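ERR on first pass: missing label on line 2. Operator R.T. fixed the label and resubmitted. Corrected input:
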Amino acid sequence: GLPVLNTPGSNQYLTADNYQSPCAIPEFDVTPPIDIPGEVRNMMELAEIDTMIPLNLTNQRKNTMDMYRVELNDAAHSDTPILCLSLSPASDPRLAHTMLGEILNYYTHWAGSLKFTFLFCGSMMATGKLLVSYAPPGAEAPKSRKEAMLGTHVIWDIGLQSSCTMVVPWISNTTYRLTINDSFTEGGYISMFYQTRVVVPLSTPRKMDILGFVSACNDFSVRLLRDTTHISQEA
Amino acid sequence: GLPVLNTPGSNQYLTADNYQSPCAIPEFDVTPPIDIPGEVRNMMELAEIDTMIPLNLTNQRKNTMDMYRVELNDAAHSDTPILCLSLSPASDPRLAHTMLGEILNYYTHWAGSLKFTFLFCGSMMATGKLLVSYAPPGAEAPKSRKEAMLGTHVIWDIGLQSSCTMVVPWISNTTYRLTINDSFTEGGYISMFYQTRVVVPLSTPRKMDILGFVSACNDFSVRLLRDTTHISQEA
Amino acid sequence: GLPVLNTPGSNQYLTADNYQSPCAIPEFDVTPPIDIPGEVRNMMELAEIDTMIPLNLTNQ
Amino acid sequence: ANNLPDTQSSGPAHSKETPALTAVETGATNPLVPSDTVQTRHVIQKRTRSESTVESFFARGACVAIIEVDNDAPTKRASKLFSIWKITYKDTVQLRRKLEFFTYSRFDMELTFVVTSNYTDANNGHALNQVYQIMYIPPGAPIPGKWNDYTWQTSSNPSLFYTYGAPPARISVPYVGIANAYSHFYDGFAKVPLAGQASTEGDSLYGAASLNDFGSLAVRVVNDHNPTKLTSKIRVYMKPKHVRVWCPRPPRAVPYYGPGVDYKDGLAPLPEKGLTTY
Amino acid sequence: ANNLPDTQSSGPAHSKETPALTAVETGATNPLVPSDTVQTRHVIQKRTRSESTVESFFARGACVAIIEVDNDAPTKRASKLFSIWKITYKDTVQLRRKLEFFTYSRFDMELTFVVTSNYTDANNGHALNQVYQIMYIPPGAPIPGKWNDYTWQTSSNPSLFYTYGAPPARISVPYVGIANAYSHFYDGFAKVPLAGQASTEGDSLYGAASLNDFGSLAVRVVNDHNPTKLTSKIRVYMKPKHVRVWCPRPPRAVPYYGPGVDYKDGLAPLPEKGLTTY
Amino acid sequence: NYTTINYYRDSASNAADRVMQLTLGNSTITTQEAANSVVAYGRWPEYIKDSEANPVDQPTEPAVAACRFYTLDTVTWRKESRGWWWKLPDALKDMGLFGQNMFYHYLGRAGYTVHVQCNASKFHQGALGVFAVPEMCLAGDSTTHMFTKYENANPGEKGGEFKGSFTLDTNATNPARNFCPVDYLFGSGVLAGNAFVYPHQIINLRTNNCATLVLPYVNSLSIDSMTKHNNWGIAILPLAPLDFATESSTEIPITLTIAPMCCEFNGLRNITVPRTQ
Amino acid sequence: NYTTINYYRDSASNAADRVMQLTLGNSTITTQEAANSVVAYGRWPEYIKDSEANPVDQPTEPAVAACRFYTLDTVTWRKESRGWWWKLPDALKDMGLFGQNMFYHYLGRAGYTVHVQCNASKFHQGALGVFAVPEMCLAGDSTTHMFTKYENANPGEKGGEFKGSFTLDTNATNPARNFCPVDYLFGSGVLAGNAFVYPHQIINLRTNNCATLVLPYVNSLSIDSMTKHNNWGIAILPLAPLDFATESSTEIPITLTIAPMCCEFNGLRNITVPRTQ
Amino acid sequence: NYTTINYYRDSASNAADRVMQLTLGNSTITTQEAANSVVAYGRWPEYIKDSEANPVDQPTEPAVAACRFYTLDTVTWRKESRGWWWKLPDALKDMGLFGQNMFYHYLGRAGYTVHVQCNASKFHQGALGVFAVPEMCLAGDSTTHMFTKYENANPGEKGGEFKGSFTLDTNATNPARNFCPVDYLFGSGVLAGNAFVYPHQIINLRTNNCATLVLPYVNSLSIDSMTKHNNWGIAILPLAPLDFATESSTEIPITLTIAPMCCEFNGLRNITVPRTQ
Ligand SMILES: CCCCCCCCCCCCC/C=C/[C@H](O)[C@H](N)CO
Ligand SMILES: CCCCCCCCCCCCC/C=C/[C@H](O)[C@H](N)CO
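pass 2 clean. output:
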């Protein structure tokens, strides 16, 4: 019939191809869809939902419910950090297993601003000011509030509103970052410090907890879908 | 000639494919069709024809003509069922071998309302009232008329009209049911009870027979054509 | 389906061919280009730049 | 094939109209819908009977023959260098039952040939790729007696030359019935015995006629024999196309026994279940 | 899937509006952007979420089954001349996790079959190219008991005949769920046990229903056995197409243990890291 | 959208109610307890159209001479009856000028009006399924396939009876070569309960005394040999067994009256004299 | 540009804020320390539309008789509490006419208004995550997969408690066949910190006393069996442990009030009496 | 003509003169013997455009505070000199407020004006090639690849010298981990004579006393870390050796004056204190 020439790539199976195939059940009467609540079109919609960060991965806290709580107290003011995180949303252990991290571990490249939301879970009678800081990479990781205040930061006043959002802006040399611990595409450093201190009256718990959440911003995106390392099979 | 690339799926034979092939008898003068009575376009047209149900599959009745007759008598009123069926039109033995069941056994999925037609084959001098009930699944199968009347049902008066149709409506969680005995897609329970009783005068047979028929409704449909288990070959 | 005939040259790989292939990373969000100085479209643009000649190729 | 009707809402009813009561003696199936006997809501139906069409029901390749051939040597009397297979769908049950759902049919056909070959022994060398000749022999045409006799010239007989390893061969056939439709059943004889003639003469098999005479397929391996024997099997898959059917019948309920409607075994197809057992 | 919004320049701010302060108790995620908390320049965004779409996320062929078959001899009891595989995505973890990101799904499917065969011994001769029959057996259809019983007529069952050496076989399936969507999770039972009946009756496995009953695949080698044994494996790759999903869930964090949500091992997925360690 | 193009010539290569009166000729039937009348497949019998005429010679249409009701031998319905069958036109081969035209011509065509009559009192029970089966092939009684002889396959107006159970004919020297129609298998390896896919009527003794079936000419050909091929088969089965007042031994007659309709015959020759049983 | 043409029939073959009042029936809830109210997936509960009705028989809509707030048994929140779970409609199976309609019908459908109440002083600490999980499947306690029995899977209004660590049921003779929901695994092998992908609200004792979740009917079917399938699962976890003034031993009640909404039932029969624990 | 049609979604799948004055801030340079001035790639330095801004936080632009000429340490040109190299911004890391902004921010961007000054009499000989090399990677001195340490790779304003011949560092205990730039290989395995593909100017002592190169910010990113990455490399090579009146031992100074231009910094934090040599 029609003269044809078989190019290279013939008879190959590429799992990413997009080709028409014969139907094995022709004329099947497909059940129509109903309007089910909660439809999702993009994985970034899930990445945009705040999920609690397992911040406290110490030996006795990891793999319990205590790994999500960070304990503050009413001690005297100090410049040492409350918590320190590395901005590796996919490879950092404290971030890898959040929903954002879980989605990023199916992709190779990511880019966009993040939001960290901290919720104060002390009593109504507790007051304080915290400093949540993001340092772009390149310099030494801030070991005191004096270093941390030189980077991006927010001073959080704990009052009638017990939650504060810090947006980590997209500050990268490359247009995309890798989802692995990588020096050339390192993200930066999140840290928390006491601004003044936590003050409580008498007959109040002197130790309280903060909970951490992370999510993506509307400018976030990923690409180069890959296989995750968070699931494996034996034999 | 024209550069071409051979995709995966080349050189395969799929029995469901739809491809053009060379004619082995070119220019054959095909005999024209005549108008033959009884043309069928859809298998559901056959499924819509009432066919007698082998309701009475007892040891001495199965695989005889007695398996189609259900014997009523003029005994005192009782709430025990006359007959009990499970709404599995393809897998239920009493329904599998009806024409509806035979067609459904070539398909994997089915959906739609059914009609059970019961014909009273007693004498003209016999009178009675029956209750034909359909219970959607989930609860215990009705063991007495008191349970059965809480489901869908029809009270059938045996008079000048000796036939009654009960429509089993389409009441399913899934948009389609399977054609096998399956818990998640179970159909329900058909049952028959005496409403009052069968009354005959003297010099009349005190035992009569009812015949059962089943068919599909115009909203019935099937899909995912498969191989039936009602025919097999040896060696 | 459509009758086809496989011409010679089918199933060959020519490193100079120009054919469409399936994408292994569909829907990838490609990083947009920025205006980088010093773009080159032709190798003759580089060939047109004066370069010093090693004229004196004596032993020493 | 097209969309089903919608379901209309039905409220309570109190009237002299009784769709439930009928008389099956008329031979007519009561065309009731759920709204006639129970209160119904409005359902915008989206299901369709597209896969229940007669075309979809038969739109599958069904194996109908496994023809065995050999390539060993002319001397070997135990090797069948060619095989003749009368064309019929009654050597297999599944397609036969699907077809015998109807008395009459009229359709084009698609024949697909899947050829698989193998060695029978190891210590005799190896073989080169084989070419198979499948010659269609319509009734009346000469039938090969040897694997290499003149009949295989195929000057007029259609012939398919299949190279082993190529995709399964395929041809299409129009409706080639001498009648206006294919007769799945023929309640009659080819001869009427006449008074006077001997009981030997005029005797014809019941239900057999020339309506179902379609010739045969002769399959051979065109190659000369290698020093080792090679056994091949051609599987024939038949797909009806442009199907029309008439006069539906109840499907076969008991095992087939021969080309006719005869039954001998498995006459008890139904199991035992209580009358009042769910 | 479409383009992201641009970044607008933001100067210094001194006002009573405090986007940073919120209340997560409401269950609502604060929709802040960088310009709300820091001074920003204008960036004309060119990145897109095209590869994050639900279609792209599932647009890969994922192995879901490795079916092993043999071609040795009927006598050999240790060789499995045919293999039946219940259709499911839970024999493998990767696709199972990607799917169980969502409670409900609705999609067409593409099945690709990659067949690889090998010899098992050397001193028994060689084999000819094999043909494999993959018969889809929907629930209720007869299941082959032997590799050459009547069930393989496939008069109604869809069947794929794959020639070894041809490109991997491929078929497409529409959405064939009896419900309006596939249920990745079913928080219930198929039976409700009723008061009075024995503990044996009414007992059903948790989370198991007929929503996920899709029949099986029966795979055999159509060829007769060569004097040497040949072992083949069919790898089934499932690609969702036209994917819709509903009700996102947190992904599986611990190893799967069976078809349900059960866990038994690896319950400590997170490593140890200091609170103030970067 | 998708694009389809045909690359071949032959299209095969392309991808895929109670009171009624019936008057025919000089015969008339009146019924008062009728369950209406069924027209098989909704097609009334008709003559061959010029657009479908295979034979070229002028047909003969005896009209009233042959298109009239002939009454067959009455059978008896008992409690033990399993059913009866007849073959058309075979059941009418000895019926007036219809049989004469049938045997004088090579080709014949006719539809039918079948009227089954079974009257019983208001104190009787029983139901009869009356089925018109196109190509009513029946199973034989021997291990040899398709071995039924012509004489038994064409019993005539008496027809045959269904059997409760299958019996195998082991007489090798003198095989019976007769049918063995099993009632619950409908005589053809199919469950009798599905026989209602065929055109049919039920005579329920409490409702109706008779059944009427208008069979069009059904065949894969426009016209065929009536001596070779039986176009239709009339099968009567007791769906509900006969019963009466517990007296027992009750038996009521079933009478069959068939009128051929739109008879056409072609190929006049000397008369055919088939071999007799 | 590129060109796409479909060569097949079936499309499958184609290429790829604080003060609030809630009144339902004769029940009313007033709140002054509310953290707003969440509508799960932004969809308000509704009745089945005629375009999506699977069952044909007329539904029954008890309206105010069943669409009203029922209060469940109060639980106690301590420092050692790991969390609690309930299943809907299972938690309401013994609640007024709602449970009666639930057990008298084969099919049932309802959305919910869940109101969790936990009041504490201004000198208390603690946070509760209240999560509505569609198809809240929980892990069992045995090496046998999916082995949890119906009686334990449907505790009723009491619900169940989460566990700190997984314990395996080794009793072969008399297996417990109960759930083993681990709090940090959310009872389903998923980290609890990601549970916020589900509709949820946090009760922070310094901010709010209550949480309100409006759950639409969520299922792969328009209507299902309420006795077989639990549409929703309410999980309450202590995100921040309860603490108070260093006194210790403090415990505050958590009360759950659920109102079914837009109840529809189909398939009336005799009542279902499920087997009890 | 030929026809092309794309069968895929992703486009990747598709088929293939003398007197001059320069004033920056409070600094001014006057030249009278200039050989014009080169703008590298014809692109003048500029600020990041909103269409290409990766970081979102507001940048700081010190303008005149940092966009001004800083003079580096003078080197001496002798007959035996092989050449010198500097890295930008590394050569300016200790230069006024420019270095302060460089070390206080995570991201920095700047173009440059490089002014090389070398005055000699009319009785001197010699030519200097002054090359601006983007990504001026230099070869190390050990068998270990890419083993040069940060301290040596960033010498500062002193820069480094080219070498006549390659020497291998065999000290295993205390490796130098320094560069080994060979003059005729341009320090990167490429012939020095081809180095003129880079933006450049030649100071021929008979013609001009100075060279001026306007380097735009060149990088694969719009903005990067100045402490990690050196955007530019300034390489000076004697093309023609220095000679004078046969006196011998003559040496003339070469002074380098670099002004950063269009400085932008992002990511303010505590200052970076890099490890010193
Ligand atoms: C090219 C040579 C070999 C292949 C050509 C063989 C052509 C034979 C086709 C005509 C005979 C078969 C026609 C149809 C078969 C049966 O009549 C149908 N199954 C009847 O239902
Ligand atoms: C041609 C014969 C063999 C190939 C045909 C096999 C067809 C089987 C397709 C229907 C059953 C599978 C449908 C989809 C599978 C699961 O439900 C999905 N992974 C659910 O998420």
